[PDB]
Design a protein around this ligand. Structure first.
Ligand code: SF4
Ligand code: SF4
Ligand code: SF4
Ligand code: SF4
Ligand code: FES
Ligand SMILES: [Mg+2]
Ligand SMILES: [Zn+2]
Lengths: 114, 48, 96, 117, 85, 208, 54, 124, 689
């Protein structure tokens, strides 16, 4: 069934837009670290950008990819315009949450979670 | 109250208290319900 | 009618009192436990029984519109008194 | 008609007015009231837990409107600020103490304003 | 090597289980009589192919697909398990 | 007299019905349905890509001068294929009337931005996007308006939990506010209030 | 208020003396009155301009 | 108009955490009639609700605490197909319960006074 | 043929004899009612269902008036509305002002139908009627001032429960409902009068004042107190099990549940196992950690192997736990796996499900012509099965015959002695009941599994199978009707037999084990006197009754209300219990405990989630994952042929059921024994008053 495309027509143009947004985020991490006075490294920021891009690597719908890059542009322009604070930028890193157990034995020990 | 004294009840406080916050007489909350689940008490006599 | 638990802690009208090994008693150290001294069950037991010469009586708790909804109590069981359960008030027919 | 600190009232005999009907709990907008009940020793329908979170309450007066026995009321007291958050988490004993403390003024106000209700 | 139990799963209405159904009707009684102490659990499937699980010692199990088998084929496959070949 | 029953206005009902027929005749390509509620409110259901033509007609037409955009929101109905229902409320001062225009969309289908018809549509569509996830194609500045920076999810959706997934606090170790998974000292007590007895026979649906 | 105990609560005296009034008070203050299905947009001239509810 | 030969999946867009996307099994069903009432107006629409998680006791005030965002979330659907479609596009696991309608029953007031059958009642 | 009637002008085809209420139900309109119940007889006394026919000057009782051809039913007409208003006006004119102090509260039909069909004001300027309250036991609380004299309880009592101690005394406005004497309405189906009473006159006494309907969360699970597999709804509130209610399943439950199911939920709050326990230097049970307890158990499991490892499954165990324990014991080549209930293993044994299943389903009883019950007391073993038999008796003149002890069932049955010699006589053909069965168009032979606990259970099974074979030979061979039946009284029995557990503990008696896993085994079949000296016992369970007192290591598990699990009822149907609350304290899910023990012992099981464990269940037996299905293959010919070859001698003892009275009904399993309400019921039925 034919559907109205948000952008990108097929998957190739969606991948192109993903690459453009990835370049935009990659060239912004030094500025983000400088302006927000982050105690993280530039390499850490670039790795976090790569990780956040990689968790959506299983998407096979061009419209979902277009919406994802739209929201990525939104949260990039929040970082560039310093609308965000260091609070949110470091919320990206989950620096205060305790490491959740992942093995069956530990999960059995701690509680009733699946 | 001198001209129209209030109705007297046996449960109304005889002595009024001001705000006792910041003093050892202050209100401390707690759960007013008993224990929901009673756990099993093992026998004190030996076995086997 | 306040009562004292074996740990020296007052027992409320709901029977609440922390166990000896319960750590939650620490909240009362250097402070106090809020317990209401008046017990409604004891006071309503102290209240007497009204004798009325009718099989059915009505209770609204006193005060009219300031009391509770008016209910009717059937005073036919001669082995007990009919209790209005809004206000716990006992009524009875004259025996003997 | 002023809505201040909360109170649980008693009948003139000393019996508690509340009958654990949970109408105030059902009608509370902010869900500030927690109620747990069971049959008493004498079989009365009475509460065992009656909590009001005064930091969650919006002092809207709905609980005293929905009460069919005039048990829960909003008293005239408004100067009850505390130094710690927990002191504002009233329970049944605290509310009964408030009722016993303010019964005369509460009764006078209810007598004055009860014909408009 | 040490067989512990046999489990035969056959759907009661699918055409592919016709041969397994024939074996149960006319050949199961003789098999059970020869192996009184062998747990031969006959169960039911909905739409999957018939199966023949063989649980050996220490919880090792092998499943053999019985799809579109005949009664003779089922008998031969079952006697292969019991013999061990 | 019936003092406890709202009086009705057949004159306004007939006028609204006539104008609904008028607009439906003028715009058959987009208008799907026209309704007049019994409290005299005209409601127009159109195709989602007729938003700009229908709104421009209702704004600039001499016989329909709906020069004011009263409101613009969306309604989430998950049981529908197109769960989101965009609603436009227009006010005509020249004829002292109000109209409602309703369209539909789902998560992955954009709706044309009406900032070229009404300037209030800018912030109204920003709020719609932020709270439901509906994307508006030609919007001068489409971004979050009400939620926190970096907030994930659209909270007015029916499938979004009431308390969300994260909560904020100040952590002394990191010397900043932190966001952690939501954890409630008292869980929101859900109440089942619906009575099992039908209230309005006029709205009874066929058993099907 | 509208003399309709299925929408507005009865008086306290009626609630404490009338069974229908007590039932309606109970239901209004526990479940609330049902509202017929439909959508409306009503606006007023609030002191800050048009205040509306959909 | 592009053509996509893919299933709808908006999990990356909904903003739900991965834990509450993967480890959640919703229950699609029509609620059973409340046995305390004879009404059947609450057994007409399908409901989608999540699996129960842990609830513990607050150390202060003894309240009921929770750590599960979706404890109170119940969704209403007009059709089992609609509910299944919503669950599939949102990526949660789902268990479907077929609607149970009462079977038709033959009633007769004259059977209470049968000449030779046991349906005759001993009281009215 | 169908006749055409009209509801509000809408055409609808209805069978002749259909009522106005049922026609409106067909078109989707529920007519208000107070006395009409579809499971009960038609009374027509509350007069709330009066509707207008288009040309009839008089309103008709919709619950009792059969429709005629071309009748137009005006459900929302002025006459119908006025009639409803008048009836509600009378009802509330005599009703008391007890709503806040009344447990019916927000789930009352009087309140809801007054808000939907009645007026909002009262014209009653007189005094009200007050009625003395009766006492009919410790389960049902009676406040008869709220009764509207609808006679639902009387009709239900008589027709359904076979107990005729409810009725109306006096006449007029002074008519009262009660026993007229101080008699306790004690029955296994006593809470359904609480359910069907539209008002708060009959309310649950254990549930009194505890909660209100809007607060409660409803968890749709099943019942484990017996092997019927009743569908229930668990009402919780702030993580606490508040109430148990019936859930309609017309093929199993049919809107009713037994008293043990309904009122034993308070046994889950007492004697609970909350923390893992080990034994110190003095031999006393003391709390410890999961890691330590599982390490000790895993050390023992590593030390011993082979037939030195046994497990006894109790009556409230689920399929996931059973299969996890089975695989864990198979990992060490051990096979001393047993259930604490005996089934004959001679011949087909547990190989064919249509040898221990109730082949004629619960709903299939209504189609039978003759039923023969052997060595069972269905009134207490399976109260809903007995209720179905009573319904079939009443509505079809079903001929019920009972071989053995004359227990007081709720219907007239033909008694046949007390000994299995009669069972042999019927098979031979000397007994006239053999001719009765031969001439029956639909026979059924139900052998209770309590009779199989005898030393000659195999002989009894062979005798009843021979009787069924004689029925099959004489009657028509063609037909899908199934005669042979087995009645189970233990919830876990069918699931265990499907998984492949050996019925009875005879294997463990034959070969005493060094390690014994009591998986909820509180029956006391095997004790330390039978076990070898210094045997290692691990009891995994939720109540400390027998196995926990006699265990070396104690592992707290989950109850049915606390775990999502699978149970198979006596007819083979599989159903899943859902989670209502979570296990208390450090208690865990049973299959999770077994899987963690396997991981610590090093023989890690191949499933880590509930879906994977149920995939293993599908591997062992797919009927454990096909839930609502009850259809299965019939292997009666093979089972009978395998039963013929080996025969033994019946004991010369009368067939005495384990439960002869309602007290023996009340006290059956661990939760019931830990329940205070069941103790109250036992005391009431023993000491009277
Ligand atoms: S005043 Fe309102 S918000 Fe406060 S406890 Fe009463 S009902 Fe709740
Ligand atoms: S409304 Fe009044 S009687 Fe009812 S629970 Fe609240 S305080 Fe108690
Ligand atoms: S039975 Fe119904 S109408 Fe009567 S007091 Fe109870 S809730 Fe109110
Ligand atoms: S007690 Fe209840 S069920 Fe029995 S006649 Fe009265 S209202 Fe009906
Ligand atoms: S429901 Fe028909 S008269 Fe009662
Ligand atoms: Mg009832
Ligand atoms: Zn009173």
């Amino acid at each position: 069934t034919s559907v109205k495309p948000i952008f990108s027509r097929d998957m190739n143009e969606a991948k192109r837009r993903v690459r453009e947004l990835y370049r935009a985020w990659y060239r912004e991490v030094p500025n983000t670290v400088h302006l927000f006075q982050l105690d993280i490294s530039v390499k850490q920021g670039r790795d976090k950008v790569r990780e956040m891009f990689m968790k959506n690597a299983h998407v096979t719908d061009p419209r979902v990819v277009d919406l994802l890059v739209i929201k990525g542009k939104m949260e990039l322009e929040e970082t560039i315009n310093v609308w965000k604070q260091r609070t949110h930028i470091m919320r990206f890193f989950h620096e205060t949450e305790a490491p959740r157990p992942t093995d069956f034995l530990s999960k059995f020990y701690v509680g009733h979670d699946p | 109250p001198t001209t129209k004294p209030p109705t007297a009840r046996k449960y109304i406080w005889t002595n009024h208290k001001f705000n006792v916050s910041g003093t050892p007489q202050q209100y401390v909350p707690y759960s007013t319900t008993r224990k929901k689940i009673q756990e099993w008490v093992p026998p004190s006599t030996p076995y086997k | 009618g306040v009562r004292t638990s074996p740990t020296g802690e007052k027992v409320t009208h709901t029977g609440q009192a922390y166990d000896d090994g319960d750590y939650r008693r620490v909240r009362f150290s250097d402070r106090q436990k809020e317990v209401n001294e008046n017990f409604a069950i004891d006071l309503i037991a102290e209240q007497p029984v009204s004798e009325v010469g009718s099989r059915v009586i009505s209770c609204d708790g006193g005060g009219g519109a300031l009391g509770h909804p008016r209910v009717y109590i059937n005073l036919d069981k001669e082995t007990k008194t009919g209790t209005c359960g809004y206000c716990g008030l006992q009524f009875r027919q004259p025996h003997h | 008609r002023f809505r201040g600190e909360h109170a649980l009232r008693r009948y003139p005999s000393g019996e508690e007015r509340c009958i654990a009907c949970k109408l105030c709990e059902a009608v509370c907008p902010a869900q500030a009231i927690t109620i747990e009940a069971e049959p008493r020793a004498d079989g009365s329908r009475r509460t065992t837990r009656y909590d009001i979170d005064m930091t969650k309450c919006i002092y809207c007066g709905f609980c005293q409107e929905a009460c069919p026995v005039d048990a829960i009321v909003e008293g005239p007291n408004f100067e009850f600020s505390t130094e710690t958050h927990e002191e504002l988490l009233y329970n049944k004993e605290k509310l009964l103490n408030n009722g016993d403390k303010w019964e005369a003024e509460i009764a006078a106000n209810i007598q004055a304003d009860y014909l408009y209700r | 090597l040490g067989l512990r139990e046999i489990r035969i799963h056959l759907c009661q209405r699918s055409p592919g289980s016709q041969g397994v159904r024939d074996f149960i009707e006319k050949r199961y009684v003789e098999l059970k009589k020869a192996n009184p102490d062998l747990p031969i659990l006959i169960r039911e499937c909905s739409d999957v192919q018939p199966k023949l699980w063989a649980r050996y010692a220490f919880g090792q199990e092998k499943n053999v697909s019985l799809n579109n088998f005949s009664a003779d084929q089922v008998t031969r496959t079952l006697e292969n398990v019991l013999s061990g070949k | 007299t019936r003092p406890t029953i709202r009086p009705r206005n057949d004159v306004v009902h007939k006028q609204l019905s006539a104008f609904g027929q008028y607009v439906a005749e003028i715009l058959p390509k987009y208008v799907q349905q026209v309704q007049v509620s019994c409290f005299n409110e005209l409601e127009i259901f159109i195709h989602p890509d007729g938003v700009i033509p229908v709104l421009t007609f209702l704004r600039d037409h001499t016989n329909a001068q709906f020069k004011s955009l009263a409101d613009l929101t969306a309604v989430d109905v998950p049981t529908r294929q197109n769960r989101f229902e965009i609603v436009y409320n227009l006010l005509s001062l020249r004829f002292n009337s109000r109209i409602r225009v309703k369209t539909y969309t789902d998560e992955l289908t954009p709706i044309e931005s009406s900032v070229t018809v009404y300037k209030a549509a800018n912030w109204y569509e920003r709020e719609i996007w932020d709270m439901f996830g509906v994307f508006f194609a030609n919007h001068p500045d489409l971004r979050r308006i009400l939620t926190d920076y970096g907030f994930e999810g659209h909270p007015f959706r029916k499938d979004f939990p009431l308390s969300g997934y994260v909560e904020l606090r100040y952590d002394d170790e990191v010397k900043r506010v932190v966001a952690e998974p939501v954890e409630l000292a008292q869980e929101f007590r859900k109440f089942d209030l619906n009575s099992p007895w039908e209230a309005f026979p006029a709205y009874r649906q066929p058993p099907e | 208020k509208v003399d309709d105990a299925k929408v507005s609560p009865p008086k306290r005296a009626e609630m404490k003396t009338s069974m229908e009034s007590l039932i309606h008070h109970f239901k209004l203050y526990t479940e609330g009155y049902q509202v017929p299905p439909g959508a409306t947009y009503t606006a007023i001239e609030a002191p800050k301009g048009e205040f509306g509810v959909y | 108009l592009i053509a996509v030969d893919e299933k709808l999946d908006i999990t990356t867009l909904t903003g739900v955490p991965e834990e509450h996307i993967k480890t959640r099994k919703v229950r699609i069903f029509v609620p059973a009639r409340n046995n305390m009432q004879s009404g059947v107006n609450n057994t007409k629409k399908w409901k989608m609700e999540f699996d129960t998680r842990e609830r513990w006791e607050n150390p202060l005030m003894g309240w009921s605490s929770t750590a599960d965002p979706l404890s109170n979330l119940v969704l209403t659907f007009s059709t089992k197909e609609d509910a299944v479609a919503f669950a599939e596009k949102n990526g949660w696991s789902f268990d479907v319960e077929e609607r149970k309608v009462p079977k038709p029953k033959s009633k007769s007031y004259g059977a209470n006074f049968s000449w030779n059958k046991r349906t005759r009642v001993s009281t009215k | 043929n169908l006749i055409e009637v009209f509801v509000d002008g809408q055409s609808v085809m209805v069978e002749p004899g259909t009522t106005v209420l049922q026609a409106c139900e067909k078109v989707g309109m529920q007519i208000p009612r107070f006395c009409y119940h579809e499971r009960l007889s038609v009374a027509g006394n509350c007069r709330m269902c009066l509707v207008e026919i288009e040309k009839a000057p008089k309103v008709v009782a919709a619950c009792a008036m059969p429709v005629m051809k071309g009748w137009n039913i005006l459900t929302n007409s002025e006459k119908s509305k006025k009639a409803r208003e008048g009836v509600m006006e009378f009802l509330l004119a005599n009703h008391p002002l007890d709503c806040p102090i009344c447990d019916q509260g927000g789930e009352c039909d009087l309140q809801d139908q007054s808000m939907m069909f009645g007026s909002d004001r009262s014209r009653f300027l007189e005094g009200k009627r007050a009625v003395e309250d009766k006492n009919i036991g410790p389960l049902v609380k009676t406040i008869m001032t709220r009764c509207i004299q609808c006679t639902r309880c009387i009709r239900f009592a008589s027709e359904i429960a076979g107990v005729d101690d409810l009725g109306t005394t006096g006449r007029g406005n002074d008519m009262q409902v009660g026993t007229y004497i101080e008699k306790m309405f004690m029955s296994e189906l006593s809470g359904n009068i609480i359910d069907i009473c539209p008002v708060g006159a009959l309310t649950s006494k254990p549930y009194a004042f505890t909660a209100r309907p809007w607060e409660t969360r409803k968890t749709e699970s099943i019942d484990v107190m017996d092997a019927v597999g009743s569908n229930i709804v668990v009402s919780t509130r702030t993580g606490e099990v508040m109430r148990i209610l019936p859930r309609m399943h017309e093929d199993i439950n049919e809107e009713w549940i037994s008293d043990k199911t309904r009122f034993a939920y308070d046994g889950l709050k007492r004697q609970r196992l909350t923390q893992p326990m080990i034994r110190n230097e003095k031999g006393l049970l003391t709390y410890t950690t999961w890691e330590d307890a599982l390490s000790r158990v895993a050390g023992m499991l590593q030390s011993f192997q082979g037939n030195d490892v046994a497990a006894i499954a109790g009556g409230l165990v689920d399929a996931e736990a059973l299969v996890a324990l089975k695989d864990l014991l198979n990992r060490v080549d051990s096979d001393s796996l047993c259930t604490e209930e005996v089934f004959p293993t001679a011949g087909a044994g547990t190989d064919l499900r249509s040898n221990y299943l109730l082949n004629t389903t619960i709903a299939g009883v209504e189609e039978a012509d003759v039923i023969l019950l052997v060595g069972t007391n269905p009134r207490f073993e399976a109260p809903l099965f007995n209720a179905r038999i009573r319904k079939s008796w009443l509505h079809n003149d079903l001929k019920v015959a009972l071989i053995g002890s004359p227990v007081d069932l709720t219907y007239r049955y033909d008694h046949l002695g007390d000994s299995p010699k009669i069972l042999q006589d019927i098979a031979s053909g000397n007994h006239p009941f053999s001719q009765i069965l031969k001439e029956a168009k639909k026979p059924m032979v139900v052998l209770g599994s309590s009779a199989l606990q005898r030393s000659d259970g195999t002989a009894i099974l062979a005798a009843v199978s021979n009787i069924a074979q004689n029925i099959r030979l004489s009657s028509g061979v063609t037909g899908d009707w199934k005669v042979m039946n087995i009645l189970h009284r233990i919830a876990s029995q069918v699931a265990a037999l499907d998984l492949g557990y050996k019925p009875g503990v005879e294997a463990i008696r034959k070969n005493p084990p060094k390690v014994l896993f009591l998986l909820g085994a509180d029956g006391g079949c095997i004790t330390r006197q039978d076990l070898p000296k210094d045997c290692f016992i691990i009891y995994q369970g939720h109540h400390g009754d027998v196995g926990a007192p006699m265990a070396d290591v104690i592992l707290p598990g989950a109850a049915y209300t606390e775990k999502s699990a699978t149970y198979v009822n006596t007819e083979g149907r599989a159903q899943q219990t859902k989670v209502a609350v979570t296990p208390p304290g450090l208690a865990r899910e049973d299959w999770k405990i077994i899987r963690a023990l396997s991981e610590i012992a090093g023989m890690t099981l191949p499933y880590d989630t509930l879906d994977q464990v149920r995939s293993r269940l599908e591997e062992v037996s797919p009927n454990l994952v096909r839930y609502d299905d009850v259809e299965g293959a019939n292997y009666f010919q093979q089972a009978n042929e395998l039963s013929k070859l080996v025969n033994q001698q019946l004991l010369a003892d009368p067939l005495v059921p384990p439960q002869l009275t309602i007290k023996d009904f009340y006290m059956t399993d661990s939760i019931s024994r830990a329940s205070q309400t069941m103790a109250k019921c036992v005391k009431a039925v023993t000491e009277g008053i």
